[PDB]
Amino acid sequence: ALNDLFIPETTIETILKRLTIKKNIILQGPPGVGKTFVARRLAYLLTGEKAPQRVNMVQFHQSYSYEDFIQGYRPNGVGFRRKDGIFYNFCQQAKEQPEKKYIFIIDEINRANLSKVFGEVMMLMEHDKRGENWSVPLTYSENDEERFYVPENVYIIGLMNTADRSLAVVDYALRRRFSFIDIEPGFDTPQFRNFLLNKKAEPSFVESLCQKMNELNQEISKEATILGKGFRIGHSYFCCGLEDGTSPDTQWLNEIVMTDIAPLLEEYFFDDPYKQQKWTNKLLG
Amino acid sequence: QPVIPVRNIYYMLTYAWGYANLEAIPGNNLLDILGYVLNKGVLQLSRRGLELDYNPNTEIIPGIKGRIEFAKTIRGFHLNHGKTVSTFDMLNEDTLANRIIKSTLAILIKHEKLNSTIRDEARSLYRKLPGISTLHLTPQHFSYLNGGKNTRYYKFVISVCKFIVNNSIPGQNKGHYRFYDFERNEKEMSLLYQKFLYEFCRRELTSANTTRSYLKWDASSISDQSLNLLPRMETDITIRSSEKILIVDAKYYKSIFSREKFHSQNLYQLMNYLWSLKPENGENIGGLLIYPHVDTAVKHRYKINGFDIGLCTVNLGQEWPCIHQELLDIFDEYLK
Amino acid sequence: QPVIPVRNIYYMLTYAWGYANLEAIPGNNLLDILGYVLNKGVLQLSRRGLELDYNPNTEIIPGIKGRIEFAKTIRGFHLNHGKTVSTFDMLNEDTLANRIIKSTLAILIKHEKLNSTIRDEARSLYRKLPGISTLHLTPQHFSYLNGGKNTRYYKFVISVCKFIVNNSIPGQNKGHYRFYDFERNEKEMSLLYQKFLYEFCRRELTSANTTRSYLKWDASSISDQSLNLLPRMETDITIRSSEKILIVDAKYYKSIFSREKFHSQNLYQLMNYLWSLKPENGENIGGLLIYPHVDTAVKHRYKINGFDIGLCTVNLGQEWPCIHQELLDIFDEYLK
């Protein structure tokens, strides 16, 4: 699961050191850099086996709740019955194999309220307060004796989208525990270039693309307070669409500029269309 | 580098906003005056009582309050742990109008240049509003409040809060604020002056009728009947009476404050208003240019192109009532 | 934030000053262009030879040179130690005109933002002028040179030196300089535009006669015949021909550069010029408002108050000759 990741080698190695210690990392960054992709591959790296079963991934939204996450009482045919959640059940599998590493991906964690979701468990999920010693009876636990304890093997990876203006402040409860990490677009890297060279792409078109995108992304990052650095465009669009072996050329490129980048600029530049026309043209002209 | 005495400016803002002793305060600068009005102004409101607007609340509680929402109740199965989703009306002071006050006071405290007595009193008030939530203010918040449900008194301080927010700039420190040097820029001071008269005239000149009048060019063009490219022309004020009409163009210039050449560029607009304006009654047409001067006031009359036009000045910094007398004295002559 | 391409501005300055390949240079910014003209311009002069103005010298020397001043000779008793006070004419390049060049070049070198090739070449030139003395330049120095004894070529670069000196601001360092962002301010760019046309029109429109015309109000006032308070009115340009006269008011606005509402405030001045202007020949009276636009040029005609007036634009940034064609094309239509 490590053949072609566009990100530099430094961060991906640092993360593995960072993750094995802190165990709760947040990956920031713009949409379209494969935040789901990189985390998924890293999940296989930490285990050393490219196995999905140990790994589970969820997308958070505001109405995502403790009931789905851990324990809830959905009705059966006659009467209400407790139902195990995802994280609750997920950990029971990890308890079987303490030697192995089990991994949980939480996409768009900033969107939902963590407190309503984790509830009691948010104290445990920090790396220190782990194991049977810190076990507590659960919210819906009928019997006091049954408890839930986060095993040390579990590692949690979270994806946060920097691009949104609507976001103002990260949740406080999140920041105390998790170690935020910034993912650059990494449009100018050897590994991404080497991918395109393997595909039917001339060297000038590669440097043409890298040169043009860098200055464009640099422009958005340059206006620091008005727009965050994380607004800068990612690279996943250029990855996708070439599974058929199509040659990457200016003819193919102009579609992606028009289809994906153009509405994205419209949202980023909601003030002046003239200023948009300045930047749309340079990519092709 | 002459400017108006700051205490006098506040009176002009008052008519501009369309609605007390300022002699006591020793701080000439504007923010000292403005905060003392607000800081004292809030104290006036609480005596009568602040506005409490019923905010309906849909929440999950352990019991029946008001109206239970059956749908959300059953779907979330809240009945089982003895809870319902019920709608009721908590009474708070957490309204947008009241929230704005607290956020503004925080800015007032953070301001680097401010009287100590003023800052101390506000900090008490900030403590005295526990329930209300601080906010990061924008004009868009003020935009929502144009409905004006609130009382007449609330609208006064809210306009004050608008002045502070727009005229707040960070200074030495990251947190602290520093007030804008409002007087120095002519445009906003001029735009104040133009609004100052229009609302002023409605109050005192009850005899005459006062409205801003939109004007249309006499032109016709073969290319476009619209003539959109042509400049938009809307009077500053028109003060019409049965015996005589009068159009005024008033602006604040820095050059005129020096007692030489004269800056009367606005006059070029005036004649064109007279031309496009055609009276059905045909009583008369008159024009006035009035500017602010500091030392003294001088009045002239002219007969230019078949029009009787007056150029006049007012000695701002004199005294507010004598100024008020002077304004009525001035208009009385020309309104004839 | 759109502005004119900088290379085009230099052409407008040329007609403004009333008097080459700029394609070669790669630095778009103004100072790169301007220094290269000067740095290359000086090299043109030295080839022909720089001005040497006889400066008479009254000095104490050990011998007779020219005319001995008998009075100062005897009174100071300089005869005894074999000396006389004699008047003679040393020939130097140390004139005010030439001194100005060297001082300007020092500023050019000190400028923080400048092409390396440009700066290196000037430093050679600064060394190549050993006799001439550096100076701290003021407009008062330039004021003395309005006599224009110098040749026509000298006047060109001196005007260039005027532009640099006035548009020089210290930047990061105490010594170094940073160029003014000339394009951004409308007033000086506008005032350039107004002068640009007036000298331009004399060159190309040889058929017509072009002069700026002072105008007098038709007014009479009982108070003062002078009417000094009234605004001073002097045309931007008048371009009169036997068949038809035409007055133009041209100004540079930022709002118009965006392709909505239109900024045509200057028009209000225009009609009043038409009114005060009375033609003896009675051939016609016409008006033109011309503004700079970047993308495209659009022309309209109007019949407003018995006057035939045109509003038009020019696509600056297009090309200098096609612009020159467009200007002649434009005036030809209305001059009819």
Ligand SMILES: Nc1nc2c(ncn2[C@@H]2O[C@H](COP(=O)(O)OP(=O)(O)O)[C@@H](O)[C@H]2O)c(=O)[nH]1
């Ligand atoms: N092979 C490869 N695929 C990538 C890379 N980066 C992104 N992708 C793919 O881009 C697509 C979108 O990823 P993602 O960022 O999760 O979509 P998003 O939800 O819009 O942000 C997926 O197919 C990713 O695997 C990469 O570096 N290498």
